[PDB]
A paper describes a structure:
To simulate GI bleeding, we utilized an injection-based microfluidics device and found that femtoliter volumes of human serum are sufficient to induce bacterial attraction to the serum source. This response is orchestrated through chemotaxis and the chemoattractant L-serine, an amino acid abundant in serum that is recognized through direct binding by the chemoreceptor Tsr. The full-length Tsr protein includes a periplasmic ligand-binding domain (LBD), a transmembrane HAMP domain, and a cytosolic coiled-coil region, which oligomerizes to form trimers-of-dimers, and complexes with the downstream chemotaxis signaling components, CheA and CheW. We report the first crystal structures of Salmonella Typhimurium Tsr in complex with L-serine and identify a conserved amino acid recognition motif for L-serine shared among Tsr orthologues. The biological distribution of Tsr reveals the chemoreceptor to be widely conserved among Gammaproteobacteria, particularly within the families Enterobacteriaceae, Morganelliaceae, and Yersiniaceae.
To capture a complex with a fully bound ligand site, we grew crystals of the soluble periplasmic portion of the SeTsr LBD with L-serine, at a high salt concentration that would serve as a cryoprotectant without further manipulation, and harvested crystals directly from drops to prevent leaching of the ligand from the binding site. The crystal structure of SeTsr LBD contains five monomers in the asymmetric unit, providing five independent views of the L-serine binding site, with homodimers formed between chains A and B, C and D, and E and its crystal symmetry mate, E′. Lower B-factors in the SeTsr ligand binding region are indicative of greater order, reflecting that our structure is fully serine-bound. SeTsr and EcTsr possess high-sequence similarity in the LBD region—100% identity of the ligand-binding residues and 82.1% identity over the entire periplasmic domain—and as expected, retain a similar global structure with all chains of serine-bound SeTsr, serine-bound EcTsr, and apo EcTsr overlaying within 0.24 Ǻ rmsd over 139 Cα. The higher resolution (+0.3 Ǻ) of the SeTsr structure, and full occupancy of the ligand, provides a much-improved view of the interactions that facilitate specific recognition of L-serine. All five chains of the SeTsr structure are consistent in the positions of the ligand and surrounding residues. Consequently, we can conclude that the correct serine pose and ligand-binding site positions for both models are those we determined using the higher resolution SeTsr structure, in which the L-serine side chain hydroxyl faces outward from the pocket, toward the solvent, and every hydrogen bonding group of the ligand is satisfied by the residues of the binding site.
Residue numbers in the entry:
A (entry chain A): 42 to 182
B (entry chain B): 42 to 181
């Protein structure tokens, strides 16, 4: 019934949320890394933050596969799902590369990566996909 | 009645998302701020990021008022809403404080603010609130 899109919706939202939480944690580690260069570091360490980003990026993978493996209503759009996955893989892959750049100390290459564009592209599909499902709500009446 | 729920969940989830983006942009600005002090600045500038964070923090405040104005079903717990609002106000106000600290060059107070705890507290209520509406959706 209409419960199969609400459960598929919740699964993709949890991926969306974990991607954002991962990007934020990485940028915290960037500040601490910067602080350590000038020996003014305090609070959370780079290692603890990198450790947390690694965890939430794996959580992101697992949340994604949980959404992929959920059944799709025949009315939904196949192209829509492929565009979601295309933008997700770029965004997820970009965060994985940010972990490597920071570990190698490439702070400029880290900061200059156009992560915002990858995120904007995924959010554009998520929003459009949220709208098409909200319409299946309005017509399932 | 079921439509009333999906509207609330979407309005509150939009606030949740905007809070996360606001915090991330502020942490991007913190890096560039430190880059400027070390003369290795590149990418997005502090000013552009600060005006982005200022922008998204207003989207958060608006997205919240949209959720708060939507009608609450009687079956929904009033105390649950008060706890969502309490944790939201702490979290929002904390992000507003980060804008003041970074604009004042206070990078240590900026980094040391326990923002994670404010976010964890709001996410705890947000998760509990959704699981309740989901069980409510199941009954109907
Ligand atoms: Cl570099
Ligand atoms: Cl970009
Ligand atoms: Cl300070
Ligand atoms: Cl904390
Ligand atoms: Na939403
Ligand atoms: Na500076
Ligand atoms: Na910019
Ligand atoms: Na309050």
């Amino acid at each position: 019934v209409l419960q199969t899109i609400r459960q598929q919706q919740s699964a993709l939202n949890a991926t969306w949320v974990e991607l954002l939480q991962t990007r934020n944690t990485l940028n915290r580690a960037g500040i601490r890394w910067m602080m350590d260069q000038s020996n003014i570091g305090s609070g959370a360490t780079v290692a603890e933050l990198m450790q947390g980003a690694t965890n939430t990026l794996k959580l992101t993978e697992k949340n994604w596969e949980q959404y992929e493996a959920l059944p799709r209503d025949p009315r939904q759009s196949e192209a829509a799902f492929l565009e979601i996955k295309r933008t997700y893989d770029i965004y997820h892959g970009a965060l994985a590369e940010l972990i490597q750049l920071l570990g190698a100390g490439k702070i400029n290459e880290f900061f200059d990566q156009p992560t915002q564009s990858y995120q904007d592209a995924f959010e554009k599909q998520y929003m459009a996909y949220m709208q098409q499902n909200d319409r299946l709500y309005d017509i399932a009446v």
